[PDB]
Design a protein around this ligand. Structure first.
Ligand code: NI
Ligand code: NI
Lengths: 570, 100, 122
């Protein structure tokens, strides 16, 4: 018996060789492979297949290969591939990617993906499923930023801050043992994974290190606290001992050094270079040349993504507010102004496209939009397809290679950089079930459902007083995963090894899952999935022209983007 | 007033429709959320007027046409559902493919 | 061209379901007075007792129809359906409790079926 492809895709989501448009972009992803057995597809509903004695096994207890949750017929978009599969979750973790159902009567059932009495079902047929976004440049300034991030598919917030204090409004820093402990306790009520960065500043080891022992998951070196050769050096020495990542916002002022001085202080050690283009901060004008080095893990923040006709005009006042500058101070204005360059922003687009800048991040509330990391990643990929064409690496009008390059910037690469990719960052077996479903029409704009540790945490859903959940108003709402003590089991607080070994979680009464930061000192640019290019980046000091391999990297600002006015109410 | 949860929430649909109607009156092609709001508030107000569910299921297809909205908006909206207090109590109105 | 956000561009060709499995066409009658709708993955011999058909020809089989669809029999309606073979371990448990094991045990299945009044045990 045969089903035409149009009808097949309508019923079960797309299969091998079918292509899906991403939102209202010009990007097309193609199904690369499909783990199903045609005719034994799992589905749930009245008179469907996942029913006792049929696609649901009525024999096995939960421990015997039965899933807690089966996502049926997902179109996975991940660094590991773009393919069709069932996703099986158990104990909060992804335990099987393959084909779920009942081995009694179905062919090809992955052995640990049995739908049994214990199995909950989420229908993903027709959806695109990605890992939760990993935002490693977060300022904790306003607790309302968490729903904003969940709504655009972000499930991990790494950064610093104590609320709307000027230190935190400028810098991703939670300074010292007490602020750290306070924010670890606060984190117990935030329905997202969190990792906290200590102040990466000091000329002695102990003041820096005690932050790591107190529970920080990494360090931030920021010029507003003095991004000197000493603070850089001491922070990397702490990090190398503690096995945590250091993020840097370097000395824009070139006050104690130029870029080559910062690199000399870094001394080949691993470091995550935040907002590498430099509008968000860094040696003027040539901080973006850090993204060519093998020991640098380079990220962009999002207000320069991608290069548009209004990008430059918004930047002056934004910067002045974030860094507590005064327009009535000319050197303040000069400092601000030196950071804002069309030349480097235009080249930043291309560097992303070439896999030279490996990661995206928001910079939430301190020159960055908490809910637009995923959004602007896809806008950039779309603008690059339009201006530069499909990449050479693609096959048959599909944008799969670009899609894998770009999805990696906000999922697996930030996780790798932070030392948390054993837990999160991708849809792989063994990793925490942080999953985002998207309708293709809303891909990258508004997440359908956000799954945190195997339970839906956030959903676009309608009137709670209605007969069914689809009537208006459909809006993003926290779900049962955020409620009561479930908030503890579905979210991870990432901490250093020494704080975990010193019993900080018990000391502070933390009930959240505790994740271990590890393996971040022996990684480099080569470990950035699909974004591993090292090269000599030349930035002309007088014209700010960017060159790679002898060629100028330039492109035009666009007047319009997709994933914008078709979707947003404001 | 004794507002319950739904009454408070549904006020925002009326407000979003008012917003979208001003945008349409100054000549803009409406986007997705705007078009949904307009048709949703149309339904709820129609229920307040005492129209039947069957009437609104059909009237809902003629509130906005494809030239009212941006490219691709018609095909984004498979249906619009809304519940409101009719003369006979709360009922659900499902408008299939409201914009052609 | 006209953008429909999230639209598919499906490949060419057709999907053959239950490929490589024996197919069998049988005639089935709803002898009851209320409608009976049978899903794609129910062991066919274990369907409602009032469906009349050669019950032996349902053993180890199910409807050869797209996963999640069904065959609907109105009261008194007789029609032909095509079956396919169960796959996997070819075991059936629960449902109407006619098999609870290998579907190879025809003999036992038919005996239970007949005893409980499942029509058509030949
Ligand atoms: Ni910065
Ligand atoms: Ni920042």
């Amino acid at each position: 018996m045969k089903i035409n492809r149009q009808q097949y895709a309508e019923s079960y989501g797309p299969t091998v060789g079918d292509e899906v448009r991403l939102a209202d972009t010009d990007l097309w992803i193609e199904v690369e492979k499909d783990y199903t057995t045609y005719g034994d597809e799992v589905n749930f509903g009245g008179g469907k297949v996942l029913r006792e004695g049929m696609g649901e096994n009525g024999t096995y207890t939960r421990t015997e290969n039965v899933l807690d949750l089966l996502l049926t017929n997902a179109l996975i978009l991940d660094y590991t591939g773009i393919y069709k599969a069932d996703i099986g979750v158990k104990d909060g973790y992804i335990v099987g990617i393959g084909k779920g159902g009942n081995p009694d009567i179905m062919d090809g059932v992955t052995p640990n993906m049995i739908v049994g009495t214990a199995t909950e079902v989420i229908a993903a047929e027709g959806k695109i499923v990605t890992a939760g976004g990993i935002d490693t440049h977060v300022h904790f300034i306003n607790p309302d930023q968490v729903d904003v991030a969940l709504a655009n598919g972000i499930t991990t917030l790494f950064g610093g801050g104590t609320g709307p204090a000027e230190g935190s409004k400028a810098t991703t820093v939670t300074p010292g043992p007490w602020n750290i402990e306070k924010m670890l306790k606060s984190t117990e009520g935030l329905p997202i994974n969190v990792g906290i960065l200590g102040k990466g500043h000091g000329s002695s080891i102990a003041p820096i290190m005690e932050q790591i022992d107190a529970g920080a998951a990494g360090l931030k070196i920021h010029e507003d606290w003095g991004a000197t050769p000493a603070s850089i050096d001491r922070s990397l020495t702490v990090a190398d001992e503690a096995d945590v990542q250091v993020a840097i916002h370097s000395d824009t002022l070139n006050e104690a050094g130029f870029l080559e001085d910062t690199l000399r202080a870094i001394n080949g050690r691993v470091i995550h270079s935040f907002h590498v283009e430099g509008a968000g901060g860094g040696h003027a004008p040539d901080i973006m040349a850090m993204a060519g080095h093998p020991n640098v893990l380079p990220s962009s923040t999002n207000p320069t993504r991608p290069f548009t006709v209004n990008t430059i005009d918004e930047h002056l006042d934004m910067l002045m507010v974030c860094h507590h500058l005064k327009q009535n101070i000319p050197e303040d204005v000069a400092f601000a102004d030196s950071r804002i360059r069309p030349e480097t922003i235009a080249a930043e687009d291309i560097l992303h496209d070439l896999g030279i800048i490996s990661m995206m991040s928001t910079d939430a509330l301190a020159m960055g939009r908490a809910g637009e990391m995923v959004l602007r990643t896809w806008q950039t990929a779309d603008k690059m397809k339009k201006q530069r064409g499909p990449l050479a690496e693609e096959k048959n009008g599909s944008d799969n290679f670009r899609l894998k390059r770009y999805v990696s910037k906000y999922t697996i690469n930030p996780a790798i950089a932070q030392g948390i990719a054993h837990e999160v960052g991708s849809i792989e077996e063994g990793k925490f079930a942080d999953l985002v479903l998207w309708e293709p029409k809303f891909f990258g704009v508004k997440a359908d459902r956000v799954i945190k540790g195997g339970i839906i945490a956030y959903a676009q859903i309608g009137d709670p007083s209605a007969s069914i959940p689809t009537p208006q108003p459909v809006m993003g709402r926290r779900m049962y995963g955020t409620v009561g003590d479930l908030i503890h089991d579905t979210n991870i607080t990432f901490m250093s090894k020494s704080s975990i070994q010193q019993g900080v979680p018990a000391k502070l009464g933390l009930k959240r899952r505790i994740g271990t930061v590890k393996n971040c000192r022996n990684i480099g640019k080569k470990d950035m999935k699909w974004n591993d290019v090292t090269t000599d980046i030349d930035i002309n000091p007088e014209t700010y022209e960017v060159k790679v391999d002898g060629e100028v990297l330039t492109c035009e600002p666009v007047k319009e983007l997709p994933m914008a006015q078709r979707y947003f109410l404001f | 007033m004794h507002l319950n949860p739904a009454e408070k929430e549904k006020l925002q649909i009326f407000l979003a429709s008012e917003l979208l109607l001003r945008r349409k009156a100054r000549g803009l092609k409406l986007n997705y959320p705007e078009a949904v709001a307009i048709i949703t508030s149309f339904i709820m107000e129609g229920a307040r007027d005492g129209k039947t569910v069957a009437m609104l299921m059909e009237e809902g297809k003629h509130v906005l046409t494809r030239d009212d909205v941006m490219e691709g908006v018609p095909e984004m909206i498979d249906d619009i559902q809304a519940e409101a207090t009719f003369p006979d109590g709360t009922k659900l109105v499902t408008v299939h493919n409201p914009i052609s | 061209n006209y953008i429909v956000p999230g639209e598919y561009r499906v490949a060419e060709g057709e999907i053959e379901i239950n490929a490589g499995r024996e197919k069998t066409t049988i005639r089935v009658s709803n002898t009851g007075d209320r409608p009976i709708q049978v899903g794609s993955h129910i062991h066919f011999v274990e369907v409602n007792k009032e469906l009349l058909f050669d019950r032996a020809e349902g053993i180890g089989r199910r409807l050869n129809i797209p996963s999640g669809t069904a065959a609907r029999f109105e009261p008194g309606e007789e029609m032909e359906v095509e079956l396919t073979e169960l796959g996997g371990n070819r075991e059936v448990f629960g449902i109407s409790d006619l098999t609870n094991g290998s579907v190879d045990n025809k003999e036992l299945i038919l005996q239970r079926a007949k005893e409980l009044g499942y029509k058509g045990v030949e």
